[PDB]
From Swiss-Prot, chain A:
One of its GO terms (biological process) is positive regulation of protein-containing complex assembly. Associates with a subpopulation of the cytochrome bc1-cytochrome c oxidase supercomplexes. Associates in substoichiometric amounts with complex IV. Interacts with COX3. One of its GO terms (cellular component) is mitochondrial inner membrane. Residues 68-78 are mitochondrial intermembrane. This is Respiratory supercomplex factor 2, mitochondrial. Residues 28-36 are mitochondrial matrix. Disruption phenotype: Increases frequency of mitochondrial genome loss. It is found in: Mitochondrion membrane. The chain holds residues 107 to 205 of 224 of the full protein. The lineage of its organism: Eukaryota, Fungi, Dikarya, Ascomycota, Saccharomycotina.
From Swiss-Prot, chain B:
Residues 1-33 are mitochondrial matrix. GO terms for molecular function: enzyme regulator activity; oxidoreductase activity. Belongs to the cytochrome c oxidase subunit 6A family. It is a single-pass membrane protein. Its main location: mitochondrion. This is Cytochrome c oxidase subunit 13, mitochondrial. GO terms for cellular component: mitochondrial inner membrane; mitochondrion; respiratory chain complex IV. GO terms for biological process: aerobic respiration; mitochondrial electron transport, cytochrome c to oxygen; mitochondrial respirasome assembly; proton transmembrane transport. The lineage of its organism: Eukaryota, Fungi, Dikarya, Ascomycota, Saccharomycotina.
Amino acid sequence: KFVEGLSNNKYKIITGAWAASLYGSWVIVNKDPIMTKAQKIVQARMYAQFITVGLLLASVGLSMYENKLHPNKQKVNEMRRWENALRVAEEEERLEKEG
Amino acid sequence: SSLPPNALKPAFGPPDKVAAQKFKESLMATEKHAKDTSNMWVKISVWVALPAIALTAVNTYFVEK
């Protein structure tokens, strides 16, 4: 029931987790005081992108965990917008006739 | 052919700085750490990468068919 609000922002959580993953991998790998800066950066980048694309499929399982709770989307939000678009026409022209 | 008198005098000073000799002995520490961290990464490769490639290959063979 929380899946609605923090699965509407999938590609915010994925990107913030990627940035935090590269930070929390870099601060781990840089504590080893023997290597070049470049090797530390590319190892941190590899660990970060691995955990990020591993989470990208967890969000797929979560995406159909949302899709059973809200069937056939993108097409019945359009008709809710359409009901709010028809009410705004009828409410307006009835007072155009009697105003 | 008439060298100036500053010819055969030395030019660089005392060649036993501890900084560069500890540099030369850190040239063994980088090689030892490379021989550790390449074995580590090849274990990462043959344990982590190849089963993921195999599972993604059977998935992509099914949907490519």
